[PDB]
Amino acid sequence: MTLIFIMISAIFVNNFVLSRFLGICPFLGVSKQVETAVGMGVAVTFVMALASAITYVVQYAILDPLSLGYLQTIAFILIIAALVQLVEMIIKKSSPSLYQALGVYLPLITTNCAVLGVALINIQNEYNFIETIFNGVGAALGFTLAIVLFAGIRERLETSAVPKALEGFPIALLTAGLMAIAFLGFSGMKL
Amino acid sequence: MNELNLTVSSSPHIRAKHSTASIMQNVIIALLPALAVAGYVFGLWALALVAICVISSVATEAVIQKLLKKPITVNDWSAVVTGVLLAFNLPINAPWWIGVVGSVFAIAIVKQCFGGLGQNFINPALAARAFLLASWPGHMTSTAYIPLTDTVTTATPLALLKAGETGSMPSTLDLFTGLNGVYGCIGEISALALLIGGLYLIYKGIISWRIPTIYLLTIAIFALLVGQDPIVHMVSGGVMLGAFFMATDYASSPVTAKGQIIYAIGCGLITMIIRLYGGYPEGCSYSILLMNVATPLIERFTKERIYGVTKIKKEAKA
Amino acid sequence: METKEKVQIDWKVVFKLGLILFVISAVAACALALTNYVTAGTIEEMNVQTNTVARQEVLPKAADFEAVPAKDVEKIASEIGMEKPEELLEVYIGKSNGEVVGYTVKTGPTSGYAGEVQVLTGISADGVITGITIIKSNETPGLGAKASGVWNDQFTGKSAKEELVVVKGTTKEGSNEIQAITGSTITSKAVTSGVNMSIQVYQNLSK
Amino acid sequence: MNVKHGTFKGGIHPPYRKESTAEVPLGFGKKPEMVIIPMSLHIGAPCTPIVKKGDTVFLGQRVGEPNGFVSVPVHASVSGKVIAVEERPHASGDRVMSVVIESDGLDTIDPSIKPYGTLEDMDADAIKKMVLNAGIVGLGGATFPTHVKLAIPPDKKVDCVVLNGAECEPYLTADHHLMTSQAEKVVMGLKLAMKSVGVEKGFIGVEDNKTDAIEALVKAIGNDSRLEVYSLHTKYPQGAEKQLIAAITGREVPSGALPADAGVVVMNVGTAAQIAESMITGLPLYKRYLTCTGDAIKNPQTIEIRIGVPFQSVIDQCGGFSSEPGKVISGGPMMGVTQFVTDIPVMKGTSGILCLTKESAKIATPSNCIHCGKCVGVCPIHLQPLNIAEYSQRNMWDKCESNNAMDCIECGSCSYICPAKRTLVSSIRVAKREIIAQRRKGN
Amino acid sequence: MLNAILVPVGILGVFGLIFGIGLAIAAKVFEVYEDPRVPLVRAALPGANCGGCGLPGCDALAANIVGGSAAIDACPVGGASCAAAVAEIMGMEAGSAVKKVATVICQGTCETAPNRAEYYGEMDCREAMIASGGSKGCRYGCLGYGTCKAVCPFDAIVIGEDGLPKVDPEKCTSCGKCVEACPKSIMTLVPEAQEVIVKCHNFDKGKIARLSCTTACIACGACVKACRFDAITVENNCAKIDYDKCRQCYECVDKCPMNCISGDVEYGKSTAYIIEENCIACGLCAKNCPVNAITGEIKKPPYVIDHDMCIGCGICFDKCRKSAIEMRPNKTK
Amino acid sequence: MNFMKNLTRGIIRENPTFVLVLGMCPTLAVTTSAINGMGMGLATMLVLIGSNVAISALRKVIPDNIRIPAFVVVIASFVTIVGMLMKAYVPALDAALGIFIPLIVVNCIILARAEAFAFSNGIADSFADAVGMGLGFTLALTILGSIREILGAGSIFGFSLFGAAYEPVLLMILPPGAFLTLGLLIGLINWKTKKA
Ligand SMILES: Cc1cc2nc3c(=O)[nH]c(=O)nc-3n(C[C@H](O)[C@H](O)[C@H](O)COP(=O)(O)O)c2cc1C
Ligand SMILES: Cc1cc2nc3c(=O)[nH]c(=O)nc-3n(C[C@H](O)[C@H](O)[C@H](O)CO)c2cc1C
Ligand code: SF4
Ligand code: SF4
Ligand code: SF4
Ligand code: SF4
Ligand code: SF4
Ligand code: SF4
Ligand code: SF4
Ligand code: SF4
Ligand code: SF4
Ligand code: SF4
Ligand code: FES
Ligand code: NA
Ligand code: NA
Ligand code: NA
């Protein structure tokens, strides 16, 4: 019952993109189509699902019983970097090469602010193995849902008369603000 | 040496009779009896606020349509509808500038920044109401709805229902007619007038029965499955107005028939989830606003079948 | 058989890639540990000083303070029927020329809007409230961060004999009544619960 | 008789102003004094003139020779003298090579015309030869050659012939008069077509507002058990060769595959009457029916008029203009073509002349889309016209093609029901033309 | 002090070494993509996604090389020098090209070619072509709704107050986006050095064209006799000029009775403007080149020649062994 | 000649906030006042200068396959040193920006400029580029923070303007109140870019 509540809070009540201001740059970058959004979502889900357990083991097996808690951040980012490299090492080989249209947002997966953010959040909340895994999966699913909804709204807006001066980024920011209001309605629930 | 000077164009050469202005005027005619009941119950200040909102809306639109070098299409009676529906969402103890700010936000940002009429994807009036509630919670929460002459009530029916004190709530007939001690928003206290207005619009052909029927059916089923009263949960709060006039917006609803059923079911589920376990006494506005975001996703999976197409089993995209 | 017998030097270029990284990592550590040392000491000192400042304002007097060995704190928490433990952090005793002046108690109540608030309360000998303060909060800067302002100053003068309740109205009625901030209610209730548990601890101890 | 019923999904309900000319008797035009006959009265390859200036021609003499296989000859309507073999204005807006013949007053029949035979000995090959020699094209509006339609390729199988009697456009009443007056000729033409194709099944589809025509056809059929009559609900796109197939047989024509792949052969009642008349008498196609009506016509009526008579003579024979017209249309109000002048001659596919006044020809300027969704509900092909129009208006042909814009039948109604008074069908036509053009310059 | 420095150094070094070795091993496996000759042509391209292409972008052109699936000179917008720089990475090429600009062959402006009727609908050329081809008196003229302006990506076309477009030669870059977008097939490409253009597209006979427009072509054929280099031909009842054989003699301009040929009477008149430095008293140009224009006696330098006639073709500028004659345009205005 | 152009690319021509849209999380998260934006901009400028100089000093031995680990190691070392100093000496700014001070290592601008300009240039161009980017980031953050604070609190730099009876717009200091504001600003700039 605790795992379900943790997942629900991570997905709906405390969405990482629309509430906590973490995954914003790829949110505005690769949300022009539905397929690219789905691919980015599944890649990011794999990255956090692999990273959470490794960060938990590294923090609780080495850093804590050594009085070396000031290296945490740099150690953490090192691991994430290697993982992202391996992801960038696979997508060009086996995954379709036409998906290399992200345009600098592929090496910025380390910079996505949601992997390291969820790692620090899991460390600060004193969770366990299963709780950390569920929190990471819930955060990834929330990111995927938000980016898919944004891509659908943009595809709908493709046939609207945005006059001449707003066009891409201003109307993307206004749409994100309206979605943020709608999710501000989804708050105050105690779980 | 007489010429003819005829006209050349493309087919067809005949059209129907209905237009946009007729539709909006019919909507206003449907909304009139609720305004009459509000003026009877809350007094002369309940009408003036409405006027203020309407004026502001029209003025804003004209100014924008003058500054962007566009034809002034203010005679389609759309800003009047937006202003009236926004004014129906206000308490009786609100200052004069709240309506002006809400109308400016509803017209300038939500509507005219996306192209104009029919080019937006979200409800203007509900978004302006949500912005006003978040910005100024003191003027819109639980005390502004009670008139200053009454000093015995001190609570609206939904707040008493959430608190568990179902011994002092008004009777079901009083909640259905809105005539004995029922307080709230000025255009939501009576369910008979809104039902008559919705039936008139169904008869004319502007709206359909699907969303209004399925919204209320889902609410009743949810209320019956948890051990509550289905009739009370349907005649209190802003549910009839939302079901008949605000969830049937043209620019925010799906165009098919199955998408409308899914949209209504989702709205009815989220409304009761926020009502029963949320941090608000009512969740109609956010349930409708959350289904304006998922609408483009429903519309890509509920398309009909073309004539003469027997479909290929997912082999064209391979 | 390692993908068709890679030709010898394919291993040698491995030794080039790791070593440099190793060196870089060492250099990073060779900085950070030194930057760890002196700052840490200063940080600790500053924190301690700040903490004692937070005490010296809560009980305006010229006296000394003594701290319990924290086993009595756990004994007090175990008794009286405290539902949620570990919510009492520090209890201090004031001493001025031997006579007991009062107590200073720090507690973190749960059930806030955004987590845990830290509330410090001081009390004189006879049951009164000489003032409260907020040490740590994570609330909204424009909505829940107003507790550390003029709202605190109204807490003084209340007797430490009965409980305190919150009323959602401008009228303050009479005794043991707290008027909440408009648009911010859960934060007021958390501080009220913390003050109530402090009063219960004082009533148990001073008898 | 066993009369069945049929209907389809979608459509509109126009005012159906046919009551004006329905009760008026049938009129006959006077003898013309000058005829202009174009060289392209069909689709395919235009003919070549075989007459010179100053020549003398007979009634029914050929004045044009077909070029290829998809082509029909062109004959003369009156007997007189040829005065010009130049090019003259056409109904398409541009000048077309024609032959001008001045009448003499006497109708001298060419001394080479004799009846072809009877139904019991003609057989299929001679029936097809007679159809080709008489220059019969489709009178339903498309003017497709009939001898090409009756030549079924060996890789296709058909088993039924359907006659189209569901006249659906407003103001038009010629088919009602033809069915009520010449039902026996319609039945004979249906039997001839059935023998030519080689099937044993035949259906006739008539709408339910022509019950007298249904009774006349039932009486004319007699005791034949291979012929049936259907009643269809009165709707506008009912008679468009596809909804007729869906209503009568229940089958669906595939995506871009012609009705011949559904096993049916669709033909008009006027074509059947012309086939029967040409078999009985031996004369070619030189005369048809018309409906002169509108808002600026003094005395609207249905009149039989030869081929080559200008529009102005027809207008003058029906009273004239009560007021200044604002629009002259060749055909119906939902699929007609607006004209520039009144020197246009009538053709084999002309079914009516509609003149509108200045007040009835005014349509408001288009406005913004309000997302009402009625155009989705009225489409018989189950498309979404708003998306295709919005994609076509900003030059996105790939999105138009991916949204199935190539199977629209250009039927009107989607543009008829719009509250914002837009031009959806024109945008769909532009998209279709661009998609068709891009397949030739890139392949 | 020793351990506090020793432990983190060892831990971080071990982590870095293990991660580096693993990353090298993974790179030796998954990087078998084996695409050689890194693009190196995108820098020599300058591309702006104009439209004289159809490979999915200039980066797609950079990726498409080393496979031999694309032409060397597939990009005409950049020019021959741009293609030379693009495929100069491997080299073995050299070339040059000629610059061109878009032009409109029509001069009927809303008063010489009026309208037959009134048109209702959208203001676009193709939409007007749906409504029976338009409402203009001339069936081959300009509609005037500016589709070509709408499809131009570089902003070079402006619709004038007379109804005909105007093209800025400084902003037009030799593409054809406005050429296939015109429903009337009116927009064409002409070299920037050409000033003699027949501006009409009427395919009718004499009387009908004369009634249709003020400056129509009636196919009289008087412009063919004036030309002697066989550069202008009349077919399909319309005249056209071949730009590869036109010497710009300005003889057909003044012979047209309906004023369909562009250009002004300011040309030539420089018969034997011979530099005295590099002719040897040649005596060869005096005899004949179709006009007399030279006649004299020996003509020792400086030359004494009166200039009052001849057409100024330009043949006497390159046929000389030393090219002592200089061509200079000097006339009234 | 080649230094002033790199220094002055910076704020106007290639502004990271208005023209590139990078580093959006601290832009939309901490800009509820005119003081947080300035401190965040100064800290990011110091980290950017140090990281750019360090990376450009070593563009001769780093291979292509392990560039990201070395880059993040250097950036994280500089971030840790700066954060330790700020914790020691400026505790109020640390408490105001607690979560985003460890997150300067991943800021979408430092890594982007490291792999695009610092890797293939000298020690003098990278320094000027870092200074220009830091100045542009600081100016944009200060402008956005002042605009948000004036509307949502009724005071600029802590000095009240409208009196003590003013009722603020509390949505401007909320997460949905940033997006719209930023969008409008960008639109205005684009208009003045395109109509001039
Ligand atoms: C919208 C639409 C309506 C039509 N209505 C009729 C009609 O009422 N009567 C008719 O005979 N053909 C009508 N047609 C033409 C038929 O589709 C078909 O071409 C015709 O039956 C062929 O007749 P034919 O074999 O004599 O050429 C219509 C076509 C369209 C697209
Ligand atoms: C049936 C119907 C319902 C409408 N509902 C709303 C509504 O809930 N809120 C609003 O602001 N405007 C409403 N409008 C009017 C409004 O101008 C329009 O529908 C678009 O939402 C404007 O983009 C409604 C109009 C119609 C015809
Ligand atoms: S889209 Fe085509 S088939 Fe559908 S209603 Fe319009 S014209 Fe008819
Ligand atoms: S009928 Fe007209 S206004 Fe309604 S959805 Fe279709 S195109 Fe839009
Ligand atoms: S025409 Fe040449 S430069 Fe332009 S987009 Fe195509 S390939 Fe690139
Ligand atoms: S040149 Fe062609 S495309 Fe341009 S306005 Fe004239 S007709 Fe239209
Ligand atoms: S005017 Fe025509 S050729 Fe010139 S740039 Fe524009 S589209 Fe290209
Ligand atoms: S006649 Fe020639 S110049 Fe005159 S409008 Fe027609 S094409 Fe243009
Ligand atoms: S300018 Fe001279 S060369 Fe050119 S077409 Fe005219 S006469 Fe011939
Ligand atoms: S002289 Fe002029 S009018 Fe005559 S053919 Fe030549 S261009 Fe045409
Ligand atoms: S043509 Fe040349 S070589 Fe001959 S006389 Fe003239 S300048 Fe001399
Ligand atoms: S311009 Fe021609 S004709 Fe005149 S002198 Fe030179 S070569 Fe002879
Ligand atoms: S995702 Fe760009 S800085 Fe956080
Ligand atoms: Na947010
Ligand atoms: Na939110
Ligand atoms: Na840090």
Q: Kindly report the CATH number assigned to the domain that includes residue E160.
A: 3.30.70.20
Ligand 11 pocket member E283 (CB < 6 A):
yes
Using CA atoms, how far apart are residues C172 and C179, in angstroms rounded to an integer?
A: 6
Backbone phi, psi, residue D181, to 5°:
-95, -40
Nearest CA in chain B to D338: B8
F68 in E contact zone (CB under 8 Å): no
Give residue limits of the domains in chain C.
Answer: 2-55, 63-205
Position D25, amino acid: P
User: For residue F118, what are the CA distances in angstroms to B250, F49, F50?
Assistant: 53, 11, 11
Q: How many angstroms separate the CA of residue E263 from the nearest CA in chain A?
A: 41
Interface of B with C in 119-178 (CB under 8 A): 137-138, 141
Ligand 5 pocket member E157 (CB < 6 A):
no
Residues spanned by CATH 3.10.20.600 within chain D? Answer: 287-362
Ligand 11 atom index nearest CA of E286: 5
Is B9 within 8 Å of E117 when comparing Cβ atoms?
no
Closest residue to A153, CB basis, from B119, B290, B296: B296
Q: How many CB atoms lie within 10 A of CB C24?
A: 22
Closest residue (by CA) to atom 6 of ligand 6?
E142
For residue A66, is it within any domain?
yes
For residue E14, is it within any domain?
no
Closest residue to B5, CB basis, from E118, E130, E131: E118
Give residue A119's domain range: 15-184
Q: List CB contacts of C116: < 8 A, sequence separation 6 or more.
A: C108, C109, C110, C136, C138
Contact E175, E77 (CB under 8 A): yes
Q: What is the 3-state secondary structure (H, E, C) of chain B?
A: CCCCCCEECCCCCCCCCCCHHHHHHHHHHHHHHHHHHHHHHHCCHHHHHHHHHHHHHHHHHHHHHHHCCCCCCHHHCHHHHHHHHHHCCCCCCCCHHHHHHHHHHHHHHHHCCCCCCCCCCCCHHHHHHHHHHHHCCCCCCCCCCCCCCCCCCCCCHHHHHHHCCCCCCCCHHHHHHCCCCCCCCCCCCCHHHHHHHHHHHHHHCCCCCHHHHHHHHHHHHHHHHCCCCCCHHHHCCCCHHHHHHHCCCCCCCCCCCHHHHHHHHHHHHHHHHHHHHCCCCCCHHHHHHHHCCCHHHHCCCCCCCCCCCCCCCCCCCC
User: For residue E165, what are the CA distances in angstroms to D115, D257, E106, E133, E180?
Assistant: 64, 44, 10, 20, 16
Position F41, amino acid: G
Residue F94, H or E segment: helix F91-96
Contact D72, D278 (CB under 8 A): no
Using CA atoms, how far apart are residues D297 and D24, in angstroms rounded to an integer?
A: 14
**CA-derived radius of gyration, chain D:** 22
Closest residue to E19, CB basis, from A62, A71, A78: A78
Backbone phi, psi, residue B239, to 5°:
-100, -45
Nearest CA in chain F to B105: F180
Give residue E45's domain range: 35-97
Using CA atoms, how far apart are residues D190 and D203, in angstroms rounded to an integer?
A: 9
Closest residue to F167, CB basis, from B109, B131, B136: B136
Closest residue to F84, CB basis, from C16, C35, C46: C35
Is A171 within 8 Å of F102 when comparing Cβ atoms?
no
For residue A5, is it within any domain?
no
What technique was this entry resolved by? cryo-EM
Is E132 within 8 Å of D429 when comparing Cβ atoms?
no
B304 in D contact zone (CB under 8 Å): yes
Give the Å distance between the CA of E311 and the centre of ligand 12.
Answer: 7
Backbone phi, psi, residue E72, to 5°:
-70, -45
D375 annotated ligand-binding residue: yes
Ligand 6 atom index nearest CA of E178: 3
Using CA atoms, how far apart are residues B293 and B306, in angstroms rounded to an integer?
A: 27
Ligand 3 pocket member D408 (CB < 6 A):
yes
Tokens of B66: 């003058």
Using CA atoms, how far apart are residues A106 and D389, in angstroms rounded to an integer?
A: 37
Using CA atoms, how far apart are residues A125 and A6, in angstroms rounded to an integer?
A: 12
Give the rounded distance of the alpha carbon of B188 from its chain centre.
11
Tokens of D433: 């033309």
Using CA atoms, how far apart are residues E264 and D323, in angstroms rounded to an integer?
A: 53
User: For residue C157, what are the CA distances in angstroms to C132, C161, C207?
Assistant: 11, 12, 22
Tokens of C204: 């148990």
Q: How many angstroms separate the CA of residue C140 from the nearest CA in chain B?
A: 13
Position D69, amino acid: F
Strand partners, E102: E189
**D287-362 has CATH 2.60.40.3500 classification:** no
Using CA atoms, how far apart are residues D30 and C19, in angstroms rounded to an integer?
A: 109
- For E197: left if phi > 0, alpha if psi spans -120 to 50, otherwise beta; the answer is beta
Q: How many CB atoms lie within 10 A of CB D115?
A: 11
Using CA atoms, how far apart are residues D146 and D130, in angstroms rounded to an integer?
A: 11
Ligand 1 atom index nearest CA of D335: 1
Give the Å distance between the CA of E192 and the centre of ligand 9.
Answer: 17
Residue E302, preceding peptide bond in cis (omega within 30° of 0):
yes
Of the listed ligands, the closest to the CA of E108 is 8
Q: Do chains D and C touch (3 or more CB pairs under 8 A)?
A: no
Is E122 within 8 Å of D426 when comparing Cβ atoms?
yes
Give the Å distance between the CA of A111 and the centre of ligand 13.
Answer: 6
Which residue, among F70, F156, F167, F63, has the nearest Cα to F114 in the 3D structure? F70
Cα of first residue to Cα of last residue in chain F, in angstroms, is 27
Residue D291, H or E segment: strand D287-294
Pocket lining for ligand 13, CB < 6 angstroms:
A 24-25, 111-113; F 23-25, 107-108
Q: How many angstroms separate the CA of residue D365 from the nearest CA in chain E?
A: 8
Contact B114, A157 (CB under 8 A): yes
Contact D30, D317 (CB under 8 A): yes
F80 in E contact zone (CB under 8 Å): no
Give the Å distance between the CA of F172 and the centre of ligand 14.
Answer: 12
Tokens of A159: 């046939």
**Count of domains observed in chain E:** 4
User: For residue D156, what are the CA distances in angstroms to B157, B251, D159?
Assistant: 74, 48, 10
Closest residue (by CA) to atom 6 of ligand 11?
E285
Ligand 3 atom index nearest CA of D410: 7
Using CA atoms, how far apart are residues F102 and A74, in angstroms rounded to an integer?
A: 9
Nearest CA in chain E to A75: E12
Give me the residue label for tokens 């971080």. E12
Is A187 within 8 Å of B279 when comparing Cβ atoms?
yes
Looking at the fold, whether E274 and E240 belong to one and the same domain comes out as no
Q: How many angstroms separate the CA of residue E173 from the nearest CA in chain F?
A: 22
Contact C200, C166 (CB under 8 A): no
* Domain range D4-24+115-281, CATH architecture: 3-Layer(aba) Sandwich (3.40)
Contact F67, E23 (CB under 8 A): no
Q: How many angstroms separate the CA of residue E118 from the nearest CA in chain B?
A: 5
Contact E307, E328 (CB under 8 A): no
**Count of domains observed in chain A:** 1
Nearest CA in chain A to C111: A190
Ligand 13 atom index nearest CA of F23: 3
C31 in A contact zone (CB under 8 Å): no
In E, which residues are within 8 Å of F73 by CB distance? 16
In C, which residues are within 8 Å of A74 by CB distance? 28, 32
Ligand 11 pocket member E325 (CB < 6 A):
yes
Residue D290, H or E segment: strand D287-294
Using CA atoms, how far apart are residues C95 and E235, in angstroms rounded to an integer?
A: 119
Question: For this experimental structure, what is the resolution in angstroms?
Answer: 3.0
Looking at the fold, whether E207 and E258 belong to one and the same domain comes out as yes
Give the rounded distance of the alpha carbon of A45 from its chain centre.
8
Position B228, amino acid: Q
Tokens of F7: 């220094």
**D32-104 has CATH 3.30.300 classification:** no
Interface of D with B in 51-80 (CB under 8 A): none
Nearest CA in chain B to F176: B131
Chain E and chain F share a number of CB contacts under 8 A equal to 11
> Of E97, E113, E135, which closes a domain?
E97
Closest residue to D338, CB basis, from B8, B18, B256: B8
Backbone phi, psi, residue B163, to 5°:
-75, -10
Looking at the fold, whether E181 and E142 belong to one and the same domain comes out as yes
Residues spanned by CATH 3.40.50.11540 within chain D? Answer: 4-24+115-281
Contact C109, C191 (CB under 8 A): yes
D408 annotated ligand-binding residue: yes
User: For residue E36, what are the CA distances in angstroms to A96, C3, D33, D350, E39?
Assistant: 19, 21, 83, 68, 9
Ligand 10 atom index nearest CA of E232: 6
Contact B112, B72 (CB under 8 A): no
C19 in E contact zone (CB under 8 Å): yes
Ligand 1 pocket member D140 (CB < 6 A):
yes
F196 in E contact zone (CB under 8 Å): no
In A, which residues are within 8 Å of C29 by CB distance? 71
Using CA atoms, how far apart are residues A136 and A145, in angstroms rounded to an integer?
A: 14
Query: Which of D374, D383, D416 has the most ligand 3 atoms within 8 A of CB, as the residue to mutate?
Result: D383
Which residue, among C122, C137, C123, has the nearest Cα to C188 in the 3D structure? C137
D379 annotated ligand-binding residue: yes
